[PDB]
mmCIF file of N, CA and C in Angstrom:
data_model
loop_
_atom_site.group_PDB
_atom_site.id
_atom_site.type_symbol
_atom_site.label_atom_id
_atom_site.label_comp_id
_atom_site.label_asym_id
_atom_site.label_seq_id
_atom_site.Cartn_x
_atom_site.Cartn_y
_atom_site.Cartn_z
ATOM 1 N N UNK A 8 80.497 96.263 53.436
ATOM 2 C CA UNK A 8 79.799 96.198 52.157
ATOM 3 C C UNK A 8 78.747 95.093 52.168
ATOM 4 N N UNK A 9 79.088 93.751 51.892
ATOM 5 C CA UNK A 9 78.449 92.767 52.065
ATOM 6 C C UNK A 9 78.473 91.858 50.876
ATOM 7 N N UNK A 10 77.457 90.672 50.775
ATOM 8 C CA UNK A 10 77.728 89.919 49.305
ATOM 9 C C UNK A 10 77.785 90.464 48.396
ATOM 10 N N UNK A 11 78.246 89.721 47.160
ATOM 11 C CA UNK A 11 78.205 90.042 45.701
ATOM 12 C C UNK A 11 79.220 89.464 44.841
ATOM 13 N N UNK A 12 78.766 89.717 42.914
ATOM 14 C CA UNK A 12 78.695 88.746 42.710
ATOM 15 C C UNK A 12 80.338 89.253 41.587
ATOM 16 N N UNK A 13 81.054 88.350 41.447
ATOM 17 C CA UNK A 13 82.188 88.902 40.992
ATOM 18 C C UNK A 13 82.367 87.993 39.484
ATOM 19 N N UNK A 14 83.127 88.776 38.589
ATOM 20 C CA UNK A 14 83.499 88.447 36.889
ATOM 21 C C UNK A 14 84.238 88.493 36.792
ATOM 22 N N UNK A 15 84.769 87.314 35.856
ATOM 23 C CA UNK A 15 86.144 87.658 34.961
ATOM 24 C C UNK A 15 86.307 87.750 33.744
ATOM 25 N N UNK A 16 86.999 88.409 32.587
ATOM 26 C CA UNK A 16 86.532 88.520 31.161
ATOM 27 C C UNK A 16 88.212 88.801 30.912
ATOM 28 N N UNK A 17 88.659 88.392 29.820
ATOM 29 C CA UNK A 17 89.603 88.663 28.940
ATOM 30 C C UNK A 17 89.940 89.013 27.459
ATOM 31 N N UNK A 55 83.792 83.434 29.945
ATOM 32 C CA UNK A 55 84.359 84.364 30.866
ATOM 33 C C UNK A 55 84.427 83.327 32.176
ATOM 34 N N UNK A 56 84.889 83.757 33.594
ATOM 35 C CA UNK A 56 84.816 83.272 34.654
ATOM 36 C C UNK A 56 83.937 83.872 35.264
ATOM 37 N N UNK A 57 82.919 83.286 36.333
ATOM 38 C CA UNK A 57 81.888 82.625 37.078
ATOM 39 C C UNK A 57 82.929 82.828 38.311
ATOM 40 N N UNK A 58 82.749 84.511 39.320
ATOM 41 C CA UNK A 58 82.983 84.237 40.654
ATOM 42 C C UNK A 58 81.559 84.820 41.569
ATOM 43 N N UNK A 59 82.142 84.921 42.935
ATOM 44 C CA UNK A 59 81.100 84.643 44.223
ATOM 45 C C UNK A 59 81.724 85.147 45.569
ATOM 46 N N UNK A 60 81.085 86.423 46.138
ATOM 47 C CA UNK A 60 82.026 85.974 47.507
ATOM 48 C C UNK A 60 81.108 87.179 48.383
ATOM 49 N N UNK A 61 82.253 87.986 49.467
ATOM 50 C CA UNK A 61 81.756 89.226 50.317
ATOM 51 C C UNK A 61 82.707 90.448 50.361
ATOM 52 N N UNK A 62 82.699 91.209 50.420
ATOM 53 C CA UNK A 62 83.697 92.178 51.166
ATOM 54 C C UNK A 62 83.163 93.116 51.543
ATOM 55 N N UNK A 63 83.923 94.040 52.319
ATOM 56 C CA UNK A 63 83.559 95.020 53.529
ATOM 57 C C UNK A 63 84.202 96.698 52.795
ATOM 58 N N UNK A 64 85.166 96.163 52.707
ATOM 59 C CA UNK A 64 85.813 97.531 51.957
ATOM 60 C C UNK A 64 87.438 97.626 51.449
ATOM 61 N N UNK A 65 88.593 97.682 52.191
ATOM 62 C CA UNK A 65 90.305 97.009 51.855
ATOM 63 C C UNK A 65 90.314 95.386 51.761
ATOM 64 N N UNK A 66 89.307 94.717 52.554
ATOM 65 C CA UNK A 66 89.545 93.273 51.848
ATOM 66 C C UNK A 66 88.349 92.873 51.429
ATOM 67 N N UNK A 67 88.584 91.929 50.448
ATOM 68 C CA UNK A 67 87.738 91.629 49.580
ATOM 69 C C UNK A 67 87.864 90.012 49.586
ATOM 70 N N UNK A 68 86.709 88.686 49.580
ATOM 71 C CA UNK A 68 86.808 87.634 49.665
ATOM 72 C C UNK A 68 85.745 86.962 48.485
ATOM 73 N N UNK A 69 86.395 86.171 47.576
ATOM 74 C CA UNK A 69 85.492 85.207 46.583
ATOM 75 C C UNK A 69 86.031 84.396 45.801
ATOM 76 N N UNK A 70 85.171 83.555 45.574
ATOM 77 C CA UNK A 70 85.679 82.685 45.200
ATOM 78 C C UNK A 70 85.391 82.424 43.566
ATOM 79 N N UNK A 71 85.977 81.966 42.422
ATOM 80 C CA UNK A 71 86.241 81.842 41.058
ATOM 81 C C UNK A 71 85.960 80.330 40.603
ATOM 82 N N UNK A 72 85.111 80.560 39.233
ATOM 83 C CA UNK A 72 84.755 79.243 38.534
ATOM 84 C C UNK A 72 84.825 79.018 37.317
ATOM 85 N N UNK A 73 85.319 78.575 36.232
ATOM 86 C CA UNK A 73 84.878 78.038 35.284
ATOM 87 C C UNK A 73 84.686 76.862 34.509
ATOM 88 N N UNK A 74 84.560 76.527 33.217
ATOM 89 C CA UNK A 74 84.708 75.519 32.612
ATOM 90 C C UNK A 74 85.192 75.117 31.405
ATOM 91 N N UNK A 115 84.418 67.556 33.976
ATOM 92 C CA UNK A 115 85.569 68.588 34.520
ATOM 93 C C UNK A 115 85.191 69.822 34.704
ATOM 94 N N UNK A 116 85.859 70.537 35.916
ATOM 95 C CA UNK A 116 85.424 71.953 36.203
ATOM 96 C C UNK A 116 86.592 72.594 36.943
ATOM 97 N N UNK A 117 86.675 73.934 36.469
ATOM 98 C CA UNK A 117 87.682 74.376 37.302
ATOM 99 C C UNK A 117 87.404 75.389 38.594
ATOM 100 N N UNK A 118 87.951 75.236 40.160
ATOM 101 C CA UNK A 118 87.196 75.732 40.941
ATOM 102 C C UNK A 118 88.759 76.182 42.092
ATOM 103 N N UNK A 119 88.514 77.850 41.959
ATOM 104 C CA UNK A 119 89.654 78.481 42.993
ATOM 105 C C UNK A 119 89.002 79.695 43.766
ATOM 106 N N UNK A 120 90.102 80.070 44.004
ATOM 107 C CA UNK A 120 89.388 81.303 45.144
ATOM 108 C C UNK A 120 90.342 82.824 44.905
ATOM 109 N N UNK A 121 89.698 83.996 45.165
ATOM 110 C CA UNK A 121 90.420 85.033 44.400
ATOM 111 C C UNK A 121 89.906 85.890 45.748
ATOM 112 N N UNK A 122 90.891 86.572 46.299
ATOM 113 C CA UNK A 122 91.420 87.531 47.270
ATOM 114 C C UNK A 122 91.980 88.944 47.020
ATOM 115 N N UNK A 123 91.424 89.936 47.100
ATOM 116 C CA UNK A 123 91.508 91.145 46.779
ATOM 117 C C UNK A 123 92.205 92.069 48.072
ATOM 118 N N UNK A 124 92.928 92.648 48.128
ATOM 119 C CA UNK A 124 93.148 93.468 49.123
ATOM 120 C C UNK A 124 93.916 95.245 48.635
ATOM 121 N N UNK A 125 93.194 96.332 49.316
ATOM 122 C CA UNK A 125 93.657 97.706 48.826
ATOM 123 C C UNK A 125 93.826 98.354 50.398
ATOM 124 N N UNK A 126 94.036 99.558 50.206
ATOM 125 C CA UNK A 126 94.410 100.498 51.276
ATOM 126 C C UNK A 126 95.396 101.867 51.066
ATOM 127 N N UNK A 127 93.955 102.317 49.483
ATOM 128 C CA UNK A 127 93.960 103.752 49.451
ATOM 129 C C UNK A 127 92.591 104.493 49.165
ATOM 130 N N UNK A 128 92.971 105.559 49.969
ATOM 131 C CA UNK A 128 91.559 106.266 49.744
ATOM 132 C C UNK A 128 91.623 107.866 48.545
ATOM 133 N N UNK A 129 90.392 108.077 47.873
ATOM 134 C CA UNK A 129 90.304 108.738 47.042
ATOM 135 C C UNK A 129 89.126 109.186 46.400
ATOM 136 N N UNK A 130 88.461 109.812 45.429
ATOM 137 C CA UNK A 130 87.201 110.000 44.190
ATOM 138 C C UNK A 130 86.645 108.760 43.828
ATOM 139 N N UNK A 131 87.359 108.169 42.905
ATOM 140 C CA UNK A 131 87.425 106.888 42.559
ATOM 141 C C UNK A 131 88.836 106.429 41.440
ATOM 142 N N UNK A 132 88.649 105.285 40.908
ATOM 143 C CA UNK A 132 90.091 104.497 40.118
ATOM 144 C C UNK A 132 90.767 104.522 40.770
ATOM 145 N N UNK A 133 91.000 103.614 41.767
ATOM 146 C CA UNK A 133 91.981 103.092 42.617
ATOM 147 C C UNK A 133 92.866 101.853 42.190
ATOM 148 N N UNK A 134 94.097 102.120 42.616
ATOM 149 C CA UNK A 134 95.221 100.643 42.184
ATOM 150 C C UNK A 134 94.429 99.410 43.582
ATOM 151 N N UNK A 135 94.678 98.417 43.374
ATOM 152 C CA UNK A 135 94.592 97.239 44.299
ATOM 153 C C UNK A 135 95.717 95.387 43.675
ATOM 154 N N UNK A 136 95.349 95.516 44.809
ATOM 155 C CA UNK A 136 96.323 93.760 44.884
ATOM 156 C C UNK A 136 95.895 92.799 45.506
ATOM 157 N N UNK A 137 96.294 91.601 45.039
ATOM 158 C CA UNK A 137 95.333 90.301 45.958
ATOM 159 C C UNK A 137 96.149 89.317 45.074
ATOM 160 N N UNK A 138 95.557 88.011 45.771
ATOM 161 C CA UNK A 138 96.312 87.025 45.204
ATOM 162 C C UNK A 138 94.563 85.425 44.860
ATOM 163 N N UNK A 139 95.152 84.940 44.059
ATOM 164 C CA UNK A 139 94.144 84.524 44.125
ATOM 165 C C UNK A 139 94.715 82.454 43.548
ATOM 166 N N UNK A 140 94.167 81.588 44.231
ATOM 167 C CA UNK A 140 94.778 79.905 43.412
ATOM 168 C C UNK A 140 93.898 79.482 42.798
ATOM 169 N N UNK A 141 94.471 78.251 41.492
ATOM 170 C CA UNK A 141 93.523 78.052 40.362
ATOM 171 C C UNK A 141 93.425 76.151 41.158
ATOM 172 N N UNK A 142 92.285 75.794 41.043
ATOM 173 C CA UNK A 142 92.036 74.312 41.115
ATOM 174 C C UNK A 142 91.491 73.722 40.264
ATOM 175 N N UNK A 143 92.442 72.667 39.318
ATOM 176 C CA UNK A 143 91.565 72.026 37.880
ATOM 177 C C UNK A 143 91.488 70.888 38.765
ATOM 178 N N UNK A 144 90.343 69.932 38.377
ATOM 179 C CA UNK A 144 90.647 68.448 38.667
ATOM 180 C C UNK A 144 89.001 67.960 38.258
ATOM 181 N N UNK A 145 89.132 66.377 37.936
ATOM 182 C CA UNK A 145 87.317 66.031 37.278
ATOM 183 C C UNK A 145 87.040 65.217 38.391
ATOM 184 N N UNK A 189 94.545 67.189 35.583
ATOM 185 C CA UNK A 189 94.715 68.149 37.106
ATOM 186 C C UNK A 189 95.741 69.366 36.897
ATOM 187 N N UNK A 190 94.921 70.446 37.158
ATOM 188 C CA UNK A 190 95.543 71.766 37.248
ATOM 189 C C UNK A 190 95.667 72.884 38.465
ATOM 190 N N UNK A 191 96.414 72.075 39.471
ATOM 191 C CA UNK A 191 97.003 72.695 40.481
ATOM 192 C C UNK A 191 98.295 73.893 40.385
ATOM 193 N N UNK A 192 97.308 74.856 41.160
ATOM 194 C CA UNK A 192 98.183 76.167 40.997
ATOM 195 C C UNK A 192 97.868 77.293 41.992
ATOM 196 N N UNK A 193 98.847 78.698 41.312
ATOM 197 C CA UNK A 193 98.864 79.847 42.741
ATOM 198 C C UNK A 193 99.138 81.079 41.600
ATOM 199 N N UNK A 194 98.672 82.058 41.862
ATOM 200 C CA UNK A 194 98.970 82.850 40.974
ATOM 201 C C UNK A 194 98.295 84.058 41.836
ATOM 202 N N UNK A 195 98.569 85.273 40.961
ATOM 203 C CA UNK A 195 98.411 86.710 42.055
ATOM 204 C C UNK A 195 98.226 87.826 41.194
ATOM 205 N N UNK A 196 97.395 88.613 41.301
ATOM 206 C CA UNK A 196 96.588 89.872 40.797
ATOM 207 C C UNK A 196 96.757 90.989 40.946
ATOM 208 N N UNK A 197 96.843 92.393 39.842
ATOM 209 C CA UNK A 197 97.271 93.353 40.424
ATOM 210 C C UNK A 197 96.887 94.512 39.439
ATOM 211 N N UNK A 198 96.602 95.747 39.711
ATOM 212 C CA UNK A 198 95.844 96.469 38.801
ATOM 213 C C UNK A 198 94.861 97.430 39.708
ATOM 214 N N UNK A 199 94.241 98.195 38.700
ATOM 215 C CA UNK A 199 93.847 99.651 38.870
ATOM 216 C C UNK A 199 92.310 99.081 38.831
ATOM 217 N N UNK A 200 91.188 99.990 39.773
ATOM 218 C CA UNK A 200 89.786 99.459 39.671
ATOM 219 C C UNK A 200 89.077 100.625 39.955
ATOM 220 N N UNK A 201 87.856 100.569 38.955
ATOM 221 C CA UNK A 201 87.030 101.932 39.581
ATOM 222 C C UNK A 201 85.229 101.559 39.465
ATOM 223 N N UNK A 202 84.398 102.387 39.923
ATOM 224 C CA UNK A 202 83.116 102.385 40.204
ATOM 225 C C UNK A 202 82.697 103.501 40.632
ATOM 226 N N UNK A 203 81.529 103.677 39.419
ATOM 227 C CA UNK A 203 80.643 105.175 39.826
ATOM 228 C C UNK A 203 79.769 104.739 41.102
ATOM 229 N N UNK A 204 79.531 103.692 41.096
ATOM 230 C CA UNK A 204 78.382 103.286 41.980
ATOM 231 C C UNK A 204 78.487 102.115 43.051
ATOM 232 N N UNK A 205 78.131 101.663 43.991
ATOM 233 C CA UNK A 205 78.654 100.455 44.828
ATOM 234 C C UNK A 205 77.387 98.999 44.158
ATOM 235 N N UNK A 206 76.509 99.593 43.704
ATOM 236 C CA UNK A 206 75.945 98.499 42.976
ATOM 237 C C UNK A 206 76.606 97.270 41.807
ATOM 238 N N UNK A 207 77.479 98.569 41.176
ATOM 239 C CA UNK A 207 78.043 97.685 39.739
ATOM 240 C C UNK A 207 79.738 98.292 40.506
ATOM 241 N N UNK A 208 80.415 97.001 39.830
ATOM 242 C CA UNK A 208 81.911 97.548 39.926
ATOM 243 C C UNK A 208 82.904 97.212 38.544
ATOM 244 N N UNK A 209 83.943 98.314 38.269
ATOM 245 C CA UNK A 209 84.626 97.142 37.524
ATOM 246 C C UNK A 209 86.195 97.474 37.454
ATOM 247 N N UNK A 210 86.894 96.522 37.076
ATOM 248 C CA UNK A 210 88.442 96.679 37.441
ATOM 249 C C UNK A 210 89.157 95.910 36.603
ATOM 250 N N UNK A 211 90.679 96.237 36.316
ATOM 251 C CA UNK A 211 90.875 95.784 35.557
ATOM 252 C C UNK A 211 92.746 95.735 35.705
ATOM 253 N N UNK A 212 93.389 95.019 35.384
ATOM 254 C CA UNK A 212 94.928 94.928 35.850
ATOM 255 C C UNK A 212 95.606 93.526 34.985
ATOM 256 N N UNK A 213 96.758 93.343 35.733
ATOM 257 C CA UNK A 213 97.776 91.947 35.330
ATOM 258 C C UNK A 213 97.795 90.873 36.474
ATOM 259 N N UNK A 214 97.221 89.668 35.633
ATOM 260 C CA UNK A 214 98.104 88.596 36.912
ATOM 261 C C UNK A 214 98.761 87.586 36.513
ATOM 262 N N UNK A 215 99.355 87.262 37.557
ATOM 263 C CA UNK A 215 100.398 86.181 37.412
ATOM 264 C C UNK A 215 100.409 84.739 37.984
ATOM 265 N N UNK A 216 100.703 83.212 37.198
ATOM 266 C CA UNK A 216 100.054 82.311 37.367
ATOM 267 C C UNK A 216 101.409 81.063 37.967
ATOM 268 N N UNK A 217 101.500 81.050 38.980
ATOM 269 C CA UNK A 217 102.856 80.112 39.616
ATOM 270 C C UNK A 217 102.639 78.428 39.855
ATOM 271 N N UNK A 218 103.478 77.695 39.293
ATOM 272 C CA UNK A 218 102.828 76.342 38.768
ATOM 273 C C UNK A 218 103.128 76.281 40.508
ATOM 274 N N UNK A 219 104.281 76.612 40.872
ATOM 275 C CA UNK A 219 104.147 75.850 42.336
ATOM 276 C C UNK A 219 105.228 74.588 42.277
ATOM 277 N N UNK A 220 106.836 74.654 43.181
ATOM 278 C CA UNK A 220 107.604 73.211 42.975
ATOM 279 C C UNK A 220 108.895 73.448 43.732
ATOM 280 N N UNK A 221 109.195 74.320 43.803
ATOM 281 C CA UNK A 221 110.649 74.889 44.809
ATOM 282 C C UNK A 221 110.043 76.621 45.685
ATOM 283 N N UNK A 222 111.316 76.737 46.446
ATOM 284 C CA UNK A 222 110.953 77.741 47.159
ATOM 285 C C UNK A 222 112.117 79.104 46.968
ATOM 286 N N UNK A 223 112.563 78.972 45.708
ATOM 287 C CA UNK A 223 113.616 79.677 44.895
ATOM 288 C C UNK A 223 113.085 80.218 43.892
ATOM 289 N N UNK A 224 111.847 80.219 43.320
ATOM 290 C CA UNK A 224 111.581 80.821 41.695
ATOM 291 C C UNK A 224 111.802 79.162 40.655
ATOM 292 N N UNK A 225 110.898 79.168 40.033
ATOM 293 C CA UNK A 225 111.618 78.705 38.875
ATOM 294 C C UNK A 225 110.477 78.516 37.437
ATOM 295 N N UNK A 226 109.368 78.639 37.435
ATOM 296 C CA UNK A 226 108.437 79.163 36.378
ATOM 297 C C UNK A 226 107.527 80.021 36.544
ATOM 298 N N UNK A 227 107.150 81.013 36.558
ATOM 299 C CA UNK A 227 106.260 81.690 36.486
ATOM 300 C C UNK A 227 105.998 82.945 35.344
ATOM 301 N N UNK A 228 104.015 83.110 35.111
ATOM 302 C CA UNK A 228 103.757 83.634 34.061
ATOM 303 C C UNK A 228 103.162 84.498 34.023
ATOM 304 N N UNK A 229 102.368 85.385 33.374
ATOM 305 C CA UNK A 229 101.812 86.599 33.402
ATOM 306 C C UNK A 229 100.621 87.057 32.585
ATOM 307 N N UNK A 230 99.937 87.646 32.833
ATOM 308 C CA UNK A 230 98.734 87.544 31.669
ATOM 309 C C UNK A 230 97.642 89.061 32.243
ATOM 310 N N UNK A 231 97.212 89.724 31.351
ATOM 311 C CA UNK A 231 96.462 90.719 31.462
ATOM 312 C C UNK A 231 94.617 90.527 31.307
ATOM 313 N N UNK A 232 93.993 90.902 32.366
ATOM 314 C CA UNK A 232 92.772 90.620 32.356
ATOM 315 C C UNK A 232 91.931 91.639 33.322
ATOM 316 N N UNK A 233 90.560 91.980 32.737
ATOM 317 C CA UNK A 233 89.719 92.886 33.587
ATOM 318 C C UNK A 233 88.026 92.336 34.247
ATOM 319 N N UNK A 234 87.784 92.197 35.395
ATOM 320 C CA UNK A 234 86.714 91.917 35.601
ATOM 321 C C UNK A 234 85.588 92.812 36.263
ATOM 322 N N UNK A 235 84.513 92.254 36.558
ATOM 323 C CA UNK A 235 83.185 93.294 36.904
ATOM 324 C C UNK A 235 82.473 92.733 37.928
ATOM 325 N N UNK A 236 82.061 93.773 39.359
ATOM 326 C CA UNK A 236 81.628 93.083 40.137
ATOM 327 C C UNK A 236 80.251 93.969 40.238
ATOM 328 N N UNK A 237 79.510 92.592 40.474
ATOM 329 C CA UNK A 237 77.495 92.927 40.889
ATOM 330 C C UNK A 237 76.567 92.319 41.124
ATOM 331 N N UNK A 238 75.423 92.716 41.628
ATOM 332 C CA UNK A 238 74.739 92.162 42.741
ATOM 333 C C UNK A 238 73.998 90.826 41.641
#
């Protein structure tokens, strides 16, 4: 595929590349907050496809974190994209479970 420019709305300010099953960019908003969001699929079809990725949040001028993405995405066109699903936000502290949260959100990717 190549660059382009990625959204978040529920706005967030992302950035990255992908080729086609993986997807790489990175996420911004607003001290500033600055993470990176990872997409990965591997089904083929028309279009509206499910996908998954994981993506970590970095606050600091502190909100250190890990959280992970998941949801259905479609596009008439490879110019504009847009998608839309649930993710989930893990403070991060043992290797057993012990807080984690959830939240619904859709974003739009373009040149």
């Amino acid at each position: 595929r190549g660059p382009y420019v990625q959204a978040d709305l529920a706005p967030r300010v992302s950035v990255g590349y992908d080729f086609g099953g993986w997807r790489i960019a990175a996420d911004y908003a607003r001290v500033s907050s600055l993470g990176l969001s990872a997409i990965y699929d591997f089904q083929i079809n028309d279009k509206f496809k499910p996908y998954i990725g994981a993506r970590v949040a970095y606050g600091h001028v502190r909100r250190v974190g890990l959280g992970v993405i998941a949801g259905v995405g479609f596009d008439i066109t490879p110019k504009l994209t847009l998608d839309a699903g649930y993710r989930y936000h893990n403070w991060g502290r043992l290797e057993n479970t012990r807080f984690k949260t959830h939240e619904a959100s859709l974003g739009v990717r373009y040149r």
